[PDB]
Amino acid sequence: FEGDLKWHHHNITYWIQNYSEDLPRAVIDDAFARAFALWSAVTPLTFTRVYSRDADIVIQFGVAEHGDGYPFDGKDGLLAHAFPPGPGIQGDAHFDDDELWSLGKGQGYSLFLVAAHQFGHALGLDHSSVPEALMYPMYRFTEGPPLHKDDVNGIRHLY
Protein backbone atom coordinates (compact mmCIF):
# COMPACT_ATOMS: atom_id res chain seq x y z
CA PHE A 1 0.00 0.00 0.00
CA GLU A 2 2.90 2.33 -0.80
CA GLY A 3 1.70 5.62 -2.25
CA ASP A 4 2.83 9.23 -2.51
CA LEU A 5 0.19 10.52 -4.91
CA LYS A 6 -2.95 12.53 -4.30
CA TRP A 7 -6.04 12.86 -6.49
CA HIS A 8 -5.81 15.55 -9.15
CA HIS A 9 -9.52 16.26 -8.87
CA HIS A 10 -11.82 17.03 -5.95
CA ASN A 11 -15.02 15.49 -7.33
CA ILE A 12 -14.35 11.97 -6.01
CA THR A 13 -16.68 9.11 -6.97
CA TYR A 14 -17.30 5.84 -5.16
CA TRP A 15 -18.97 2.57 -6.04
CA ILE A 16 -20.37 0.23 -3.43
CA GLN A 17 -19.68 -2.96 -5.35
CA ASN A 18 -21.10 -5.44 -2.80
CA TYR A 19 -22.43 -5.59 0.77
CA SER A 20 -21.80 -7.20 4.15
CA GLU A 21 -24.43 -9.71 5.27
CA ASP A 22 -24.38 -8.16 8.77
CA LEU A 23 -26.25 -4.94 7.99
CA PRO A 24 -29.18 -3.73 5.84
CA ARG A 25 -28.10 -2.20 2.53
CA ALA A 26 -29.73 1.10 3.57
CA VAL A 27 -27.61 1.14 6.74
CA ILE A 28 -24.43 0.36 4.78
CA ASP A 29 -25.00 3.08 2.18
CA ASP A 30 -25.66 5.62 4.92
CA ALA A 31 -22.63 4.57 6.92
CA PHE A 32 -20.34 5.03 3.92
CA ALA A 33 -21.97 8.36 3.02
CA ARG A 34 -21.53 9.62 6.58
CA ALA A 35 -17.91 8.44 6.60
CA PHE A 36 -17.24 10.38 3.41
CA ALA A 37 -19.11 13.42 4.76
CA LEU A 38 -16.51 13.66 7.53
CA TRP A 39 -13.82 14.39 4.98
CA SER A 40 -15.82 16.72 2.76
CA ALA A 41 -16.78 18.75 5.82
CA VAL A 42 -13.21 20.05 6.19
CA THR A 43 -12.00 20.16 2.58
CA PRO A 44 -13.15 21.19 -0.90
CA LEU A 45 -13.55 17.49 -1.66
CA THR A 46 -16.91 16.03 -2.65
CA PHE A 47 -18.04 12.41 -2.86
CA THR A 48 -20.54 11.10 -5.37
CA ARG A 49 -21.90 7.57 -5.40
CA VAL A 50 -21.85 5.99 -8.86
CA TYR A 51 -22.57 2.53 -10.26
CA SER A 52 -19.51 1.73 -12.38
CA ARG A 53 -16.07 0.17 -12.05
CA ASP A 54 -14.81 3.57 -13.26
CA ALA A 55 -15.45 5.09 -9.83
CA ASP A 56 -12.32 6.38 -8.10
CA ILE A 57 -13.04 4.49 -4.91
CA VAL A 58 -14.38 0.97 -5.41
CA ILE A 59 -15.75 -0.35 -2.11
CA GLN A 60 -15.65 -4.13 -1.71
CA PHE A 61 -16.52 -6.53 1.10
CA GLY A 62 -14.39 -9.65 0.73
CA VAL A 63 -13.33 -12.83 2.48
CA ALA A 64 -9.92 -14.51 2.34
CA GLU A 65 -8.41 -14.05 -1.14
CA HIS A 66 -10.28 -11.20 -2.78
CA GLY A 67 -8.26 -10.02 -5.76
CA ASP A 68 -5.01 -8.57 -4.43
CA GLY A 69 -1.81 -9.57 -2.69
CA TYR A 70 -3.28 -9.19 0.80
CA PRO A 71 -6.04 -11.77 1.48
CA PHE A 72 -8.11 -11.36 4.61
CA ASP A 73 -7.33 -13.64 7.54
CA GLY A 74 -10.71 -14.10 9.17
CA LYS A 75 -12.30 -13.14 12.47
CA ASP A 76 -10.49 -10.16 14.00
CA GLY A 77 -6.93 -9.27 13.06
CA LEU A 78 -6.96 -7.34 9.79
CA LEU A 79 -10.30 -5.50 9.58
CA ALA A 80 -9.79 -3.71 6.27
CA HIS A 81 -7.28 -1.92 4.05
CA ALA A 82 -7.32 0.70 1.28
CA PHE A 83 -5.00 1.64 -1.57
CA PRO A 84 -3.54 5.14 -2.00
CA PRO A 85 -4.72 7.49 -4.81
CA GLY A 86 -4.17 6.36 -8.38
CA PRO A 87 -5.75 4.43 -11.27
CA GLY A 88 -7.22 0.95 -11.08
CA ILE A 89 -7.20 -0.78 -7.73
CA GLN A 90 -5.57 2.38 -6.35
CA GLY A 91 -7.97 4.30 -4.12
CA ASP A 92 -10.15 1.22 -3.50
CA ALA A 93 -11.32 0.22 -0.01
CA HIS A 94 -11.65 -3.45 1.00
CA PHE A 95 -13.47 -4.71 4.10
CA ASP A 96 -13.14 -8.23 5.60
CA ASP A 97 -16.67 -9.63 5.65
CA ASP A 98 -15.44 -12.32 8.07
CA GLU A 99 -15.61 -9.58 10.72
CA LEU A 100 -18.81 -8.75 12.57
CA TRP A 101 -19.83 -5.34 11.20
CA SER A 102 -22.04 -3.12 13.36
CA LEU A 103 -22.28 0.52 14.52
CA GLY A 104 -22.08 2.38 17.84
CA LYS A 105 -21.54 0.75 21.23
CA GLY A 106 -21.69 -3.05 21.44
CA GLN A 107 -19.89 -6.05 19.95
CA GLY A 108 -18.54 -6.08 16.41
CA TYR A 109 -16.61 -3.33 14.62
CA SER A 110 -18.07 0.03 13.57
CA LEU A 111 -18.34 0.07 9.77
CA PHE A 112 -18.69 3.86 9.99
CA LEU A 113 -15.40 4.46 11.82
CA VAL A 114 -13.46 1.80 9.95
CA ALA A 115 -14.76 3.10 6.60
CA ALA A 116 -13.89 6.70 7.49
CA HIS A 117 -10.35 5.53 8.35
CA GLN A 118 -10.06 3.61 5.06
CA PHE A 119 -11.31 6.58 3.03
CA GLY A 120 -8.50 8.54 4.67
CA HIS A 121 -6.02 6.12 3.09
CA ALA A 122 -7.90 6.25 -0.24
CA LEU A 123 -7.35 10.02 -0.16
CA GLY A 124 -3.62 9.73 0.43
CA LEU A 125 -3.44 9.84 4.22
CA ASP A 126 -0.93 7.63 6.05
CA HIS A 127 -1.31 6.27 9.58
CA SER A 128 -1.10 8.73 12.46
CA SER A 129 0.99 8.33 15.62
CA VAL A 130 -1.70 10.11 17.65
CA PRO A 131 -3.64 7.42 19.63
CA GLU A 132 -6.83 9.51 19.45
CA ALA A 133 -6.62 10.30 15.75
CA LEU A 134 -8.93 8.45 13.37
CA MET A 135 -5.88 7.49 11.31
CA TYR A 136 -4.33 5.62 14.24
CA PRO A 137 -3.61 2.00 13.08
CA MET A 138 -5.38 0.37 16.05
CA TYR A 139 -9.16 0.06 16.30
CA ARG A 140 -11.09 1.31 19.32
CA PHE A 141 -14.66 2.55 19.52
CA THR A 142 -15.46 5.91 21.09
CA GLU A 143 -18.22 8.50 20.79
CA GLY A 144 -17.79 12.03 19.47
CA PRO A 145 -16.39 13.52 16.21
CA PRO A 146 -14.12 10.93 14.56
CA LEU A 147 -11.75 13.48 13.02
CA HIS A 148 -8.98 14.60 15.35
CA LYS A 149 -7.11 17.89 14.75
CA ASP A 150 -4.28 15.74 13.43
CA ASP A 151 -6.64 14.16 10.88
CA VAL A 152 -8.02 17.52 9.74
CA ASN A 153 -4.52 18.98 9.30
CA GLY A 154 -3.37 15.95 7.37
CA ILE A 155 -6.20 15.99 4.84
CA ARG A 156 -6.11 19.78 4.34
CA HIS A 157 -2.34 19.66 3.83
CA LEU A 158 -3.16 17.52 0.79
CA TYR A 159 -6.29 19.25 -0.56
Ligand X SMILES: N[C@](CS(=O)(=O)c1ccc(Oc2ccccc2)cc1)(C(=O)NO)C(F)(F)F
Residues that bind Cl ion (CB under 5 A): 18-19, 62, 66, 103-104, 110, 112
Among 80, 122, 125, 155, binds ligand X (CB under 6 A): 80
Which parts of 48-87 interact with Zn ion (CB under 5 A)? 68
Residue among 79 and 155 whose Cβ is closer to ligand X: 79
Binding residues (CB under 5 A) for Ca ion: these are: 20, 22, 40, 73, 77-78, 91-92, 96-97
Smallest Cα–Cα separation from 32: which of 127, 118, 99? 118
Smallest Cα–Cα separation from 119: which of 73, 75, 159, 155? 155
66 touching ligand X, by CB under 6 A: no
Sign of the alpha-carbon torsion through 103, 105, 107, 113:
positive
CB of 109 to ligand X, least distance (A): 8
Q: How far apart are alpha carbons 152 and 133 in whole angstroms?
A: 9
CB of 122 to Ca ion, least distance (A): 8
Rg (CA), the chain: 14
